[PDB]
Amino acid sequence: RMVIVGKISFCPKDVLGHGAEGTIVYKGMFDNRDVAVKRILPECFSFADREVQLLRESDEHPNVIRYFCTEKDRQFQYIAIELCAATLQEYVEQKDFAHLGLEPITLLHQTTSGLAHLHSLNIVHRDLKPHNILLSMPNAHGRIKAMISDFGLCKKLVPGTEGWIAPEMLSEPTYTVDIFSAGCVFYYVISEGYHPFGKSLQRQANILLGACNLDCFHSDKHEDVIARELIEKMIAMDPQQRPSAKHVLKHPFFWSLEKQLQFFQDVSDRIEKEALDGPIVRQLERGGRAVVKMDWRENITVPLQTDLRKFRTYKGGSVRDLLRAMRNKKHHYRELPVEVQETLGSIPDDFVRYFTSRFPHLLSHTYQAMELCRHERLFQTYYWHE
Amino acid sequence: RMVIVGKISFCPKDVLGHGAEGTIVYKGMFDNRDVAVKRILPECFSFADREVQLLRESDEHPNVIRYFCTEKDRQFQYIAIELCAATLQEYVEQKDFAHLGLEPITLLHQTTSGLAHLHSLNIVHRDLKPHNILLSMPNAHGRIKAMISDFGLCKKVPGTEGWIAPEMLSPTYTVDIFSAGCVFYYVISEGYHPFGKSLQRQANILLGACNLDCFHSDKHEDVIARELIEKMIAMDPQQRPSAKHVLKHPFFWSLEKQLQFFQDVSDRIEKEALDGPIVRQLERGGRAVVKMDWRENITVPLQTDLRKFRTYKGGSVRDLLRAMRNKKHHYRELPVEVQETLGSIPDDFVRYFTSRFPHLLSHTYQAMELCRHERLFQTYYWH
Ligand SMILES: Nc1ncnc2c1ncn2[C@@H]1O[C@H](COP(=O)(O)OP(=O)(O)O)[C@@H](O)[C@H]1O
Ligand SMILES: Nc1ncnc2c1ncn2[C@@H]1O[C@H](COP(=O)(O)OP(=O)(O)O)[C@@H](O)[C@H]1O
Numbered sequence: 034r035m036v037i038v039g040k041i042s043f044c045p046k047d048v049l050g051h052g053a054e055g056t057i058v059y060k061g062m063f064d065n066r067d068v069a070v071k072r073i074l075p076e077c078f079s080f081a082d083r084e085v086q087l088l089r090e091s092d093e094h095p096n097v098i099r100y101f102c103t104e105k106d107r108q109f110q111y112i113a114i115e116l117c118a119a120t121l122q123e124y125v126e127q128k129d130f131a132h133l134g135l136e137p138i139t140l141l142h143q144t145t146s147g148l149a150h151l152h153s154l155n156i157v158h159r160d161l162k163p164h165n166i167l168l169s170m171p172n173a174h175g176r177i178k179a180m181i182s183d184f185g186l187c188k189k190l191v192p193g194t195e196g197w198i199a200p201e202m203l204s205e206p207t208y209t210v211d212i213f214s215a216g217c218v219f220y221y222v223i224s225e226g227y228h229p230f231g232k233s234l235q236r237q238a239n240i241l242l243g244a245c246n247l248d249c250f251h252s253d254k255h256e257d258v259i260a261r262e263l264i265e266k267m268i269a270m271d272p273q274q275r276p277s278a279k280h281v282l283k284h285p286f287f288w289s290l291e292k293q294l295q296f297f298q299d300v301s302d303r304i305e306k307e308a309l310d311g312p313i314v315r316q317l318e319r320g321g322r323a324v325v326k327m328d329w330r331e332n333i334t335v336p337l338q339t340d341l342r343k344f345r346t347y348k349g350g351s352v353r354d355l356l357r358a359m360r361n362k363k364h365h366y367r368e369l370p371v372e373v374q375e376t377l378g379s380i381p382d383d384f385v386r387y388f389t390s391r392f393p394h395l396l397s398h399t400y401q402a403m404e405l406c407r408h409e410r411l412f413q414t415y416y417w418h419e
Numbered sequence: 420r421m422v423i424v425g426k427i428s429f430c431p432k433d434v435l436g437h438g439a440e441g442t443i444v445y446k447g448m449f450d451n452r453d454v455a456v457k458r459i460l461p462e463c464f465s466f467a468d469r470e471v472q473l474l475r476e477s478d479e480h481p482n483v484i485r486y487f488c489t490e491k492d493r494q495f496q497y498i499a500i501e502l503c504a505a506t507l508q509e510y511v512e513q514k515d516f517a518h519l520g521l522e523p524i525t526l527l528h529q530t531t532s533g534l535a536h537l538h539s540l541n542i543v544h545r546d547l548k549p550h551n552i553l554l555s556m557p558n559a560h561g562r563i564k565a566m567i568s569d570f571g572l573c574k575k576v577p578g579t580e581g582w583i584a585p586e587m588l589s590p591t592y593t594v595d596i597f598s599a600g601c602v603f604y605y606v607i608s609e610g611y612h613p614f615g616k617s618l619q620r621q622a623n624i625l626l627g628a629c630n631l632d633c634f635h636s637d638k639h640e641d642v643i644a645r646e647l648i649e650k651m652i653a654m655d656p657q658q659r660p661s662a663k664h665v666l667k668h669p670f671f672w673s674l675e676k677q678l679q680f681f682q683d684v685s686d687r688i689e690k691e692a693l694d695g696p697i698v699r700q701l702e703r704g705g706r707a708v709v710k711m712d713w714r715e716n717i718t719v720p721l722q723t724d725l726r727k728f729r730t731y732k733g734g735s736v737r738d739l740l741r742a743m744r745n746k747k748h749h750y751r752e753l754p755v756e757v758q759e760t761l762g763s764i765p766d767d768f769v770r771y772f773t774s775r776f777p778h779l780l781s782h783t784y785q786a787m788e789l790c791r792h793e794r795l796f797q798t799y800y801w802h
């Protein structure tokens with residue numbers, strides 16, 4: 034038994050899900066495309082059409098959901114939205130969600146970028162949760178994309194939802210609240226379900242308390258060291274400590290394998306032809322022996338060490354010698370003994386994974402100690418300024 | 420085996436139909452809605468995207484279909500357009516068809532309004548025909564509407580064997596007005612073409628040969644529809660009316676509109692001398708339309724009641740119209756017998772009189788062309 038309320042339309046029996054404060058989402062229609070229609074009480078939730086229009090008038094971003102149209106029933110409010118296949122919950126939780134075929138880390142790239150698109154428009158979500166990060170229906174060749182939804186709306190008379198509210202929002206808003214929320218959903222995605230804060234009932238209590246677990250992030254694993262390093266700052270209690278929408282996009286956490294490798298190359302080149310006394314080099318061996326595992330030479334595979342023994346001239350007590358060795362080996366890769374190629378290669382995936390496997394703090398240490406050269410013409414693909 | 424050439428997508432197994440000169444149309448996708456994608460060879464047809472872009476940058480007309488986006492394969496050209504239910508063909512010829520939902524004259528109306536909107540944009544369809552008028556899939560509350568398609572593209576002679584205005588063989592909107600005339604007949608006739616069967620169609624059109632066999636002269640609606648289509652399929656390009664002129668024609672009027680015309684005219688003609696040029700023009704056709712004496716060509720209750728006042732000449736058009744208007748006005752206080760024969764207003768009533776004087780509206784219309792500029796007669800007449 035269908036309803037109209039013209040310019041939008043739906044059937045009430047096809048209900049998708051109930052939201053906060055008595056709002057309901059069904060599967061309706063529009064032109065003829067399948068749509069999710071969100072039906073809202075105007076006294077509870079407050080749509081702000083101005084922001085949404087600004088979204089429309091500006092260049093369409095691929096990871097920020099589009100609102101079809103808005104009309105005000107007497108006692109209600111009606112929104113027609115691209116029917117998505119699921120929310121982030123189905124993704125990380127159901128596990129059966131046949132991707133396809135996107136990685137969680139690109140998922141977070143998408144999300145953070147879309148969010149950044151919002152923040153460029155000086156627009157803040159106020160309620161970033163796994164339910165407000167939706168997944169498209171499969172596209173042409175079957176690929177899936179992630180968009181943020183439920184933006185530009187709020188509550189009259191605290192916004193957001195229990196569990197995903199920043200600390201400072203609960204003590205008598207800018208982008209930072211969205212960056213905190215985003216850190217949480219990052220952990221929720223990476224950690225296959227666990228919340229950093231950590232159980233449902235205690236979650237927000239610990240948010241104000243400052244309790245974090247993060248126990249999924251070992252210290253002997255590269256990717257975990259990176260993830261931890263970023264999320265640590267995203268969910269920092271001090272809102273001034275939280276990284277901006279773009280800043281997060283620029284993190285090593287997002288880099289491709291090739292990008293990490295190239296990072297190691299570039300770094301090795303730029304540190305070469307400068308004195309050991311210089312600021313950069315001295316700083317690069319600041320953490321020193323720690324990351325290298327004392328001497329890097331014995332901590333690597335056999336053939337590689339036979340070649341290196343044949344050539345070095347490589348202290349091993351230095352990270353810089355390691356970097357330089359990696360750059361040399363990457364460069365001269367093709368003209369190397371086939372066994373060496375077998376252990377190292379292929380470039381760049383297996384190559385760089387071969388070193389970050391064995392030195393989990395290498396990329397991190399290099400990246401941080403090389404912040405000095407952040408302004409140089411080469412490193413703007415790597416670092417942020419303002 | 421899905422095809423991409425993004426952003427469009429289709430299965431070459433779900434073909435909807437072959438087109439002209441190799442082009443074909445399949446049921447494809449876009450965002451996530453079903454669409455129809457027709458592929459063309461860019462070596463045959465030349466798209467003018469300035470026109471379609473101009474369509475986009477102008478007001479959305481409910482009867483002009485929309486081409487979603489245009490893009491080029493290396494070897495092909497792809498157009499994705501709103502997926503429709505059928506063409507005029509299935510509308511007319513498929514005996515078990517759901518309109519649902521829409522009358523044929525409302526169909527033609529829609530078609531002509533979309534057509535007029537196109538013409539307003541200084542774009543000429545160049546190829547009007549049934550396949551190029553389409554039926555939409557049911558909407559919100561089920562209602563089907565009709566949209567015109569395949570406009571804005573041409574061939575590297577435009578048109579189609581059967582519907583091509585003769586002077587294009589020996590272009591302006593007049594061509595579309597002519598093709599439109601053809602489709603008007605085609606629709607109203609429930610299957611027939613004026614010119615009139617397939618192979619001779621274009622021979623007979625260069626000839627000037629018309630059929631119009633299904634339009635009698637004893638049925639009012641026939642006389643009107645004919646009166647228009649004739650002017651639409653006139654072999655002289657400057658004779659055919661403009662796309663809006665076609666719309667303003669009595670053919671499209673509602674019954675309320677018709678009876679309102681009759682009353683307005685009857686109020687106007689009155690208090691003007693009988694030698695007067697307007698009234699004299701009105702009685703030029705005279706007897707023939709009035710059937711000698713209109714008193715004798717109505718029901719017996721009405722005439723036995725018209726006896727009591729007349730005053731009603733009966734050979735005269737003005738007097739019939741004025742009797743209509745007077746009996747209309749004083750309807751409340753008429754005997755139940757007379758009320759009953761006339762039937763409820765305006766439907767049964769204006770039909771009561773149009774039944775018996777099929778030429779009456781056509782005649783009064785043409786005769787009242789005299790006062791076309793008047794501020795009361797503008798809802799009826801062209802400018
Ligand atoms: N755009 C959408 N498309 C499809 N399903 C949706 C959409 N938005 C929400 N849903 C589903 O409907 C439910 C209600 O969502 P919503 O009204 O946004 O409140 P909340 O933000 O608390 O989930 C959600 O759990 C989600 O699973
Ligand atoms: N939007 C549409 N929806 C469904 N079918 C269509 C559509 N457009 C065209 N067709 C089908 O494609 C066939 C021919 O394609 P086209 O070149 O557009 O028409 P024609 O060749 O008759 O001018 C028609 O007979 C019609 O059935």
Ligand SMILES: *Cc1cc(-c2ccc(N3CCOCC3)cc2)cc(OC)c1O
Nearest residue numbers: 340341344345346357358361362365368
């Ligand atoms: C790993 C590594 C490799 C070289 C090196 C490799 C290959 C060449 N050539 C030039 C002559 O032979 C053909 C290819 C030269 C040098 C050098 C170093 O550094 C000593 C090194 O670490």
Ligand SMILES: [Mg+2]
Nearest residue numbers: 164165182183
């Ligand atoms: Mg939501």
Ligand SMILES: [Mg+2]
Nearest residue numbers: 550551568569
């Ligand atoms: Mg067609």
